[PDB]
Design an enzyme around this catalytic site. Structure first.
Site, PDB file in Angstrom:
ATOM      1  N   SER A  15      -0.347  15.535 -12.105  1.00  0.00           N
ATOM      2  CA  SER A  15      -0.501  15.297 -13.315  1.00  0.00           C
ATOM      3  C   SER A  15      -0.843  16.581 -14.287  1.00  0.00           C
ATOM      4  O   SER A  15      -1.392  17.470 -13.817  1.00  0.00           O
ATOM      5  CB  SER A  15      -1.938  14.270 -13.588  1.00  0.00           C
ATOM      6  N   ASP A  24       0.812  -1.101   0.024  1.00  0.00           N
ATOM      7  CA  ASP A  24       0.044  -0.020  -0.139  1.00  0.00           C
ATOM      8  C   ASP A  24       0.973   1.433   0.071  1.00  0.00           C
ATOM      9  O   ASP A  24       1.384   1.751   0.918  1.00  0.00           O
ATOM     10  CB  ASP A  24      -1.091  -0.161   1.084  1.00  0.00           C
TER      11      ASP A  24
END
Length: 330
Positions: free
Chosen positions: A199, A35
Site C-alpha cells: 500500500s 481464505d
C-alpha cells in the site's frame, strides 16, 4: 467457465463469511470459509473426532461415488490465531457457484482445535492463497483456484464482501457492475505464498494522506485490519477515550465515540473504510467498551488487510502468470 457464489457473514459483526460448496456425488453442501491467506481446502468430516464436532455439517467420503483416498497423504495446519487442524486426504469433485473441479484435494479433518469446534457455522476452509503454502505431504496439492484456472474464461477470482450483508465471490470474470470508477492494479509478491502487496499510504478521517509504503497481505480469512503500531496509534489518537488494553488484547473505545474513516492507498488510488466498519462491538455482553477493527500487527510479523479493509472494496485476485491485485471502490 465461470462460477459465482454468495458469501454470507456468520454473525452480526462480520467475524467471517461462509460460502456454500458442493463436494462429492451426490453433492454434499458444506459452508466453507474462503481464505485468501491459506491454501488448504479442509472440511469437518465423518473422520473428525466426535468430541470435536458441535453442529457442523460433515463431509462423508464413503457416501460419495467420486471420492478416492489420496493414499498416504496427510495434512496439518496452524493459523495465525493459534487454531489448527489435521487429517488425511481424499480427491473428489468440488463445485463453487456452478464452477466444477474434478480431482480436487479435499482434506478431511481427523482433529480440529477448540476454536473450530466452537464455531458451528464454519464447516471448513477453502484456501485461495498460492499452492506453495498447501500443507499436504508428501505431495503438495493445488488450491481450488489453481485447479480451475486453465478452464476459467480469465485466470482471476474476485472478492466483494459485504458490510453486515452478503457479498459475492466470482471465478473467471470481473463483474463490471459490481464497482464504481476504475480498478487500480498493484504488484504482488508470491515469495511468502500470500497475496502480498504494498500500500502507498494512509489517511485518518479527513486528515492529510501520508505517503508511506506498507507491505501486507490481502487476507479474506482474517477479520480485522492489522497495521504497523505507528499507523494504528495515529488512528486511535483521533477517537475520544480510545486506548490499547493489554487485558483485552488491543485497542478499545467507548461505544459513545464516533469513529473516523480510514483511507489506504493503492497506487495513486484510495480506498475509504467508513468509520462504522471499524466498530466490532462490546468486548463482552453489556460492556461500554467496544473493540476496534484496526489493530497493531506488531508481533504478527506481517501486516494484514483483512475483512475490515477488503469489504470496503471490490478486490481482484489476478492469477495470471504475473499475479497482481486490483482494488476498486464500490
Amino acid at each position: 467457465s465461470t462460477g459465482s457464489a454468495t458469501t454470507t457473514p456468520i454473525d452480526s459483526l462480520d467475524d467471517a463469511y461462509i460460502t456454500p460448496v458442493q463436494i462429492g456425488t451426490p453433492a454434499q453442501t458444506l459452508n466453507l470459509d474462503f481464505d485468501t491467506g491459506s491454501s488448504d481446502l479442509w472440511v469437518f468430516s465423518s473422520e473428525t473426532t466426535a468430541s470435536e464436532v458441535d453442529g457442523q455439517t460433515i463431509y462423508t467420503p464413503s457416501k460419495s461415488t467420486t471420492a478416492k483416498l489420496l493414499s498416504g497423504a496427510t495434512w496439518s495446519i496452524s493459523y495465525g490465531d493459534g487454531s489448527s487442524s489435521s487429517g488425511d486426504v481424499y480427491t473428489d469433485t468440488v463445485s463453487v457457484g456452478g464452477l466444477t473441479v474434478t480431482g480436487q484435494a479435499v482434506e478431511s479433518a481427523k482433529k480440529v482445535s477448540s476454536s473450530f469446534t466452537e464455531d458451528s457455522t464454519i464447516d471448513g476452509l477453502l484456501g485461495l492463497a498460492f499452492s506453495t503454502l498447501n500443507t499436504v505431504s508428501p505431495t503438495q496439492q493445488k488450491t481450488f483456484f489453481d485447479n480451475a484456472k486453465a478452464s476459467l474464461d480469465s485466470p482471476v477470482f474476485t472478492a466483494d464482501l459485504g458490510y453486515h450483508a452478503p457479498g459475492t465471490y466470482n471465478f473467471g470474470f470481473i463483474d463490471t457492475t459490481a464497482y464504481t470508477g476504475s480498478i487500480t492494479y498493484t504488484a504482488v509478491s508470491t515469495k511468502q505464498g500470500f497475496w502480498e502487496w504494498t500500500s502507498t499510504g494512509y489517511a485518518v478521517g479527513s486528515g492529510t494522506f501520508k505517503s508511506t509504503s506498507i507491505d501486507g497481505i490481502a487476507d479474506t480469512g482474517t477479520t480485522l485490519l492489522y497495521l504497523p503500531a505507528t499507523v494504528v496509534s495515529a488512528y486511535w489518537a483521533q477517537v475520544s477515550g480510545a486506548k490499547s488494553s493489554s487485558s483485552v488484547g488491543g485497542y478499545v473505545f467507548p461505544c459513545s465515540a464516533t469513529l473516523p474513516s480510514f483511507t489506504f492507498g493503492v497506487g495513486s488510488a484510495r480506498i475509504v473504510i467508513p468509520g462504522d466498519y471499524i466498530d466490532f462491538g462490546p468486548i463482552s455482553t453489556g460492556s461500554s467498551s467496544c473493540f476496534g477493527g484496526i489493530q497493531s500487527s506488531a508481533g504478527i510479523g506481517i501486516n494484514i488487510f483483512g475483512d475490515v479493509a477488503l469489504k470496503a472494496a471490490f478486490v481482484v485476485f489476478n492469477g495470471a502468470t504475473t499475479p497482481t491485485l486490483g482494488f476498486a471502490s464500490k
